[PDB]
Design an enzyme around this catalytic site. Structure first.
Site, PDB file in Angstrom:
ATOM      1  N   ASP A   8       0.867  -1.154   0.000  1.00  8.04           N
ATOM      2  CA  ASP A   8       0.000   0.000   0.000  1.00  8.04           C
ATOM      3  C   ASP A   8       0.916   1.218   0.000  1.00  8.04           C
ATOM      4  OD1 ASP A   8       0.799   0.647   2.639  1.00  8.04           O
ATOM      5  OD2 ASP A   8      -1.272   1.327   3.156  1.00  8.04           O
ATOM      6  N   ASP A  35      -3.565   5.058   1.776  1.00  6.66           N
ATOM      7  CA  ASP A  35      -4.030   5.712   2.980  1.00  6.66           C
ATOM      8  C   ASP A  35      -3.657   7.186   2.919  1.00  6.66           C
ATOM      9  OD1 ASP A  35      -4.955   3.330   3.959  1.00  6.66           O
ATOM     10  OD2 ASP A  35      -2.991   2.903   4.928  1.00  6.66           O
ATOM     11  N   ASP A  39       1.197   5.251   1.604  1.00  4.69           N
ATOM     12  CA  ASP A  39       0.713   6.101   2.677  1.00  4.69           C
ATOM     13  C   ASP A  39       1.150   7.545   2.449  1.00  4.69           C
ATOM     14  OD1 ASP A  39      -0.235   3.810   4.289  1.00  4.69           O
ATOM     15  OD2 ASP A  39       1.892   3.306   4.266  1.00  4.69           O
TER      16      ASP A  39
HETATM   17 MG   LIG Z   1       2.124   1.181   4.059  1.00  6.75          MG
END
Ligand SMILES: [Mg+2]
Ligand SMILES: [Cl-]
Ligand code: NA
Ligand code: NA
Length: 331
Positions: A194, A255, A196
């Site tokens: 992911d 995120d 961020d």
């Molecule tokens: Mg991450």
DNA sequence: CGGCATACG
DNA sequence: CGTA
DNA sequence: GCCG
């Protein structure tokens, strides 16, 4: 020579005990699946100690005196050194419980408690879950639909393209606001699962109300495959973003976090990780220094005052710790 | 023995 | 409950 | 599971 807390020692991203640490992290993960948070922490800490060593462990002798190595973790290392495999670790690896709990908890929207309940109900595969969709939350339905894409890592190249589209939306939402890459990519990872981003503004208070404005702009650009306020105050958003690919696209977890500039060093520290590093830093703060740390601030409960910080360097100094750059926070 | 990080959605 |  |  080896301090007991991970925040007291540099831990690089790559190291000299990869196989030993991976085995201990299997046992940590299996402990988590059974709800054994203390044993998870010990095995994670033992693995992290090996990551911090300057050379390979070749003999069981070299574990004497290392923190977090007792009879169980030492036996794991001894079997790997002697035979190249640890029977306990391999039994975990092939177990139906481990494999299914790993598959289910990898779903966005599914944690250990949900996975365990599904396991006890007899469910074993993703297609089992798809045949039972009324038992799924909106979030879990998105996690299951996008699971294949979300299982494949993102490259740093991909990250830079995403940062530019986030910066465009942020600039329209609030001119002067800034976007900082955090998470594992800030620790030097070349790939990851992911991305961020931490958003702030140099004028304290101007960031209030910002994240809804950013999310609506990204949604209008067609870039948001899932987020929790898609139907619409918040400061963290856990999204699934459309990322361009040759002739197509893929889903990526992103995120987004907003912090006021007064809190930005604390948020930057927290969101940069690693997870174990931050748990160890907060434990160190409270237990060794009597100060309470989180991603918003550092509180002295005796004086009832918050520390002002203008940098991560300030925070390490407040705690009496040698500064570690993000690439040495890979506990 | 108690403790094990600490928040937000 | 989920998320980091 | 390990530490203090
Ligand atoms: Mg991450
Ligand atoms: Cl436990
Ligand atoms: Na999950
Ligand atoms: Na006990």
């Amino acid at each position: 020579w080896m301090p007991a807390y991970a925040c007291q020692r540099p831990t690089p991203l790559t190291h000299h005990n990869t196989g030993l640490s991976e085995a201990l992290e299997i046992l940590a993960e299996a402990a988590g699946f059974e709800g054994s948070e203390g044993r998870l922490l010990t095995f994670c800490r033992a693995a992290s100690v090996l990551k911090a060593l300057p050379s390979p462990v070749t003999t069981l002798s070299q574990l004497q005196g290392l923190p977090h190595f007792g009879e169980h973790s030492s036996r794991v290392v001894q079997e790997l050194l002697e035979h190249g495999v640890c029977e306990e670790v391999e039994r975990v690896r092939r177990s139906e419980r481990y494999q299914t709990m790993k598959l289910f908890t990898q779903i966005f929207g599914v944690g250990v408690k949900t996975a365990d309940r599904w396991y006890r109900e007899g469910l074993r595969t993703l297609d089992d879950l798809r045949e039972q969709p009324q038992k799924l939350t909106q979030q879990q339905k998105a996690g299951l639909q996008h699971h294949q894409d979300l299982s494949t890592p993102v490259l740093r190249s991909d990250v830079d393209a995403l940062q530019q589209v986030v910066e465009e939306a942020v600039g329209q939402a609030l001119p002067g606001a800034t976007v900082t890459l955090t998470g594992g990519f800030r620790r030097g990872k070349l790939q990851g699962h992911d991305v961020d981003f931490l958003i702030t503004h140099p004028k304290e208070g101007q960031e209030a109300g910002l994240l809804p404005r950013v999310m609506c702009r990204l949604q209008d650009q067609g870039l948001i495959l899932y987020h929790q306020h898609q139907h619409s105050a918040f400061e963290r958003s856990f999204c699934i973003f459309r990322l361009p690919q040759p002739g197509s696209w893929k889903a990526v977890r992103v995120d987004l976090v907003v912090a006021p500039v007064s809190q930005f060093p604390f948020a930057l520290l927290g969101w940069t990780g690693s997870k174990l590093f931050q748990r160890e830093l907060r434990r160190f703060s409270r237990k060794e220094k009597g100060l309470w740390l989180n991603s918003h601030g550092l509180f002295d409960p005796e004086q009832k005052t918050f520390f002002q910080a203008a940098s991560e360097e300030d925070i390490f100094r407040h705690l009496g710790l040698e500064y570690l750059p993000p690439e040495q926070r890979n506990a």
